Every structure is written in structure tokens, then in C-alpha cells.
Enzyme design. Structure first.
Site, PDB file in Angstrom:
ATOM      1  N   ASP A 118       2.931  -5.615   0.278  1.00 18.70           N
ATOM      2  CA  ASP A 118       2.676  -4.308   0.858  1.00 18.70           C
ATOM      3  C   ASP A 118       2.842  -3.173  -0.158  1.00 18.70           C
ATOM      4  O   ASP A 118       3.945  -2.664  -0.359  1.00 18.70           O
ATOM      5  CB  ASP A 118       3.624  -4.073   2.054  1.00 18.70           C
ATOM      6  CG  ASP A 118       3.318  -2.816   2.805  1.00 18.70           C
ATOM      7  OD1 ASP A 118       2.291  -2.150   2.532  1.00 18.70           O
ATOM      8  OD2 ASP A 118       4.114  -2.483   3.710  1.00 18.70           O
ATOM      9  N   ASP A 145      -3.297   0.746  -0.453  1.00 15.21           N
ATOM     10  CA  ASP A 145      -2.343   0.084   0.477  1.00 15.21           C
ATOM     11  C   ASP A 145      -2.746  -1.340   0.884  1.00 15.21           C
ATOM     12  O   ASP A 145      -3.555  -1.526   1.815  1.00 15.21           O
ATOM     13  CB  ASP A 145      -2.188   0.936   1.749  1.00 15.21           C
ATOM     14  CG  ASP A 145      -1.105   0.411   2.670  1.00 15.21           C
ATOM     15  OD1 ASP A 145      -0.406  -0.541   2.249  1.00 15.21           O
ATOM     16  OD2 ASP A 145      -0.970   0.952   3.796  1.00 15.21           O
TER      17      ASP A 145
END
Ligand code: 5T7
Ligand code: NA
Ligand code: NA
EC number: 3.4.23.46
Length: 384
Positions: free
Chosen positions: A37, A227
Site C-alpha cells: 500500500d 496509490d
């Protein structure tokens, strides 16, 4: 430098469930799968027997666990988790041959966080301390890694997406370097604007080469980030409105329900007949390394139309439109990253993009990274 065979193909996943890497925590090592992440900064792992989890961190079994006597409550837009902070020895088996003492949030209660049927049990927040919970004094994993070893201060991600017929997704996380086998052509770099999220500046947006002609500040309202922990390409509302109008127009030879474009319903086609050609490409121009210089990255409908396999209600090839409106700025999620090899060059405060050797395409079109272009007033595109 340039070749890390031990790390190639160290990512796995299932379509719609993200990309994870194997890690170990504690002594003796406890193996966990961990979602990669770049949109957060905490290393957080299931530590209690939640029914969705294949396994969880059992601190009582680790001789090297150190309790920080501090908890954290982490609410997201939807869903939340609560944890207890500590440190332990952490390794990445298909990564560098090192072991570091890292912060770990042991998740003891969560809501709408873990996925029923997924194969991961925690998250690896690879962004910077500024956005760590509870505050910036909780050193993120990658910061500990670089502090405690000779691993260079950079990592790279190649996320390899899916297509009908549904095979697992995969890819590579190269920790401490770049593997040149993972991309074609040249890397082009965009500056990291500020070290919190991996924030970047988009200076121009085109749909099939047609410029949206918006004030570029709109593209980065209130930020734009890279992201790996988000599926969609999220666009600021006003930009999404314009982009979707342009995409509908480009694809107008077939009409789809209004809800499709809002991600409120799927569209399905008879197997093998997805009309890729009617859908436009999407280009983002990013601020370059030099004054008044930019470069362009371009993705295909193969990235932004997501295959949805688990549809018991239907017999066909069904897809979700995965460009969506945002209130948090542009999010360059998996829809963008699956086109490219992405280099998080922390040492030089820049992000490199090159065409991914694994990206999904067809005989007519491929994802692209092209430059240089001449773009004036790029500094005005940042929101303050
Ligand atoms: C903390 C957080 C969680 C960990 C993210 C998450 O669960 N992501 C995903 C869930 C489900 C399917 C996915 C598919 C892909 Cl390709 C990526 N991530 C997927 N991180 C980010 N960056 O944004 C959301 C968030 F909540 F803030
Ligand atoms: Na170091
Ligand atoms: Na190459």
C-alpha cells in the site's frame, strides 16, 4: 543494481482484492501475506482470530516482540481498525536478505477492512511518516529498513493485471533497486511534491488525445497521489465530470446505461467480444524533472474496465468502470499502475514511470510513456 532475480514475481493477488507480498514477523518467523500500500504509512496486521483471516500475528509466540504500551484507532472513509503498537523483527523472504526491527500495529478489532475470501492478513504502508497513525513519530517500515541496513532508499512496483479468462494477478516489488527486465523503453521521472503521500502534479489530461482544457489546478485538487492500495483511477469531481463526458462521446457508437459510468452497475459482453476499440485511451501528463518539461503516461480500457468474475447472476464477460469521482484529489491506483513499472525513488524525491513489460493490451494499442513535452506554468498546477 539493475537485476534482482530473487524478487521478481514476489507479488500475488486476486482480481478485485489487491496485490500482496509474503512477510515474516517475530522469532521464530510467522509468515503473513501483506497488501502493498503506497497510499498509507502503517505496518498493520491482523493479531486476533477474525473469521475472514487465514492467519494472524500471535505476539505471545515471538521472543523478540517489544510492547510500546500504546494503542491506535484508525478510521477510514468506510471501515476502521484498532490496534496495539509494538516492535518486532520483520523480513521479506522474497526480498533483501535482511531483518529489521519495525513498528507493527497488532489489529485487535476491525470493521469493513479485511476482505472475506482474500489471501492477505495485513497492510504494508509504504508512504511517509507525515501520514503515519497516530502521528509522525511512528517510523514507517521502509524508513526502518533503510535506517538499519544497506538497502538503498528506493523501491519499485510492477503490478500485472488480469483479463478474461479468472487467473490470479501478480507482479514484482523490487526492494532497494530497479530490475530493467520489468519495463521497456525509458523511465521518465516526476518530482515527489511533498513527502507524505507519494504526491505528484498532473499538468494536462487528454482523452484519445483530446485535451480537457481545464485549469490544471483542477487536476490536483486538493492533491494527486500514486496509490497501490486503491483500485480506481480517482479524479476530482469536476475533472471526472469532464472526463466521463469525453469518454461517453468517444464511445458513443454503443450506448451504456448512465449507472455504468457512475460505477453503479456492470456492463457485460458475450465472451471474447469486448469492444476495446470503441473506448478511448486516457493520458495524464506529469510534471517533469526540468523547468517547463513534462512527459505523458497513457493507459487503455484494459486498465480502466475491470473484469468481474464473481457474478452468479450472469453468464457473460462482465466489467466495472473504474474511473471514479473523488473528494480526496486524484488517486493513481491500480488502473494507472498496471500500465507501468513504477519507481519510488525516495533518495531523489521522484517517481519514475516506464511501460510495463507485463501490462494488458491488444494488437492495436499499448500503454505508453512518452516525452519530452513543453508545458508552461506547471508550478501553478499544485493546489495550496
Ligand atoms: C488503508 C487503505 C486500505 C489498505 C487499502 C485497501 O484495503 N485496499 C484495497 C481493498 C480492496 C481491493 C483493493 C484492490 C487493489 Cl488493486 C488495491 N487495494 C485494494 N489504503 C489505501 N491506499 O486506500 C484505502 C485505505 F483504506 F485508506
Ligand atoms: Na542505510
Ligand atoms: Na528494459
Amino acid at each position: 543494481r539493475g537485476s534482482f532475480v530473487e524478487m521478481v514475481d514476489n507479488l500475488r493477488g486476486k482480481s478485485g482484492q489487491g496485490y500482496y507480498v509474503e512477510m515474516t514477523v517475530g522469532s521464530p518467523p510467522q509468515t503473513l501475506n501483506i497488501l502493498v500500500d503506497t497510499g498509507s504509512s502503517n505496518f498493520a496486521v491482523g493479531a486476533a482470530p477474525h473469521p475472514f483471516l487465514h492467519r494472524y500475528y500471535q505476539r505471545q509466540l515471538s521472543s523478540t516482540y517489544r510492547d510500546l504500551r500504546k494503542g491506535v484507532y484508525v478510521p477510514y472513509t468506510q471501515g476502521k481498525w484498532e490496534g496495539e503498537l509494538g516492535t518486532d523483527l520483520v523480513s521479506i523472504p522474497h526480498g533483501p536478505n535482511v531483518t529489521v526491527r519495525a513498528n507493527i500495529a497488532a489489529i485487535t478489532e476491525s470493521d469493513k477492512f479485511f476482505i472475506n475470501g482474500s489471501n492477505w492478513e495485513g497492510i504494508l504502508g509504504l508512504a511517509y511518516a507525515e501520514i503515519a497513525r497516530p502521528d509522525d513519530s511512528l517510523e514507517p517500515f521502509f524508513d526502518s529498513l533503510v535506517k538499519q541496513t544497506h538497502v538503498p532508499n528506493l523501491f519499485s512496483l510492477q503490478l500485472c493485471g488480469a483479463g478474461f479468462p479468472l487467473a490470479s494477478v501478480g507482479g514484482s516489488m523490487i526492494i532497494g533497486g530497479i530490475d530493467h527486465s520489468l519495463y521497456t523503453g525509458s523511465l521518465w521521472y516526476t518530482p515527489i511534491r511533498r513527502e507524505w503521500y507519494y504526491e505528484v502534479i498532473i499538468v494536462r489530461v487528454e482523452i484519445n488525445g483530446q485535451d480537457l482544457k481545464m485549469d490544471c489546478k483542477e487536476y490536483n485538487y486538493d492533491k494527486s497521489i500514486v496509490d497501490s492500495g486503491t483500485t480506481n483511477l480517482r479524479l476530482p469531481k469536476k475533472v471526472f465530470e469532464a472526463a466521463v463526458a469525453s469518454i461517453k462521446a468517444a464511445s458513443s457508437t454503443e450506448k451504456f446505461p448512465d449507472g455504468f459510468w457512475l460505477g453503479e452497475q456492470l456492463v457485460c459482453w458475450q465472451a471474447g467480444t469486448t469492444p476495446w476499440n470503441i473506448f478511448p485511451v486516457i493520458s495524464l501528463y506529469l510534471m517533469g524533472e526540468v523547468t517547463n518539461q513534462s512527459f505523458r503516461i497513457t493507459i487503455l480500457p484494459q486498465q480502466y474496465l475491470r473484469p468481474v468474475e464473481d457474478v452468479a447472476t450472469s453468464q457473460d464477460d462482465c466489467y466495472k468502470f473504474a474511473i471514479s469521482q473523488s473528494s480526496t484529489g486524484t488517486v493513481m491506483g491500480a488502473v494507472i499502475m498496471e500500465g507501468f513499472y513504477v519507481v519510488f525513488d525516495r533518495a531523489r524525491k521522484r517517481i519514475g514511470f516506464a511501460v510495463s513489460a507485463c501490462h494488458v493490451h491488444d494488437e492495436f494499442r499499448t500503454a505508453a510513456v512518452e516525452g519530452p513535452f513543453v508545458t508552461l506554468d506547471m508550478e501553478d498546477c499544485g493546489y495550496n
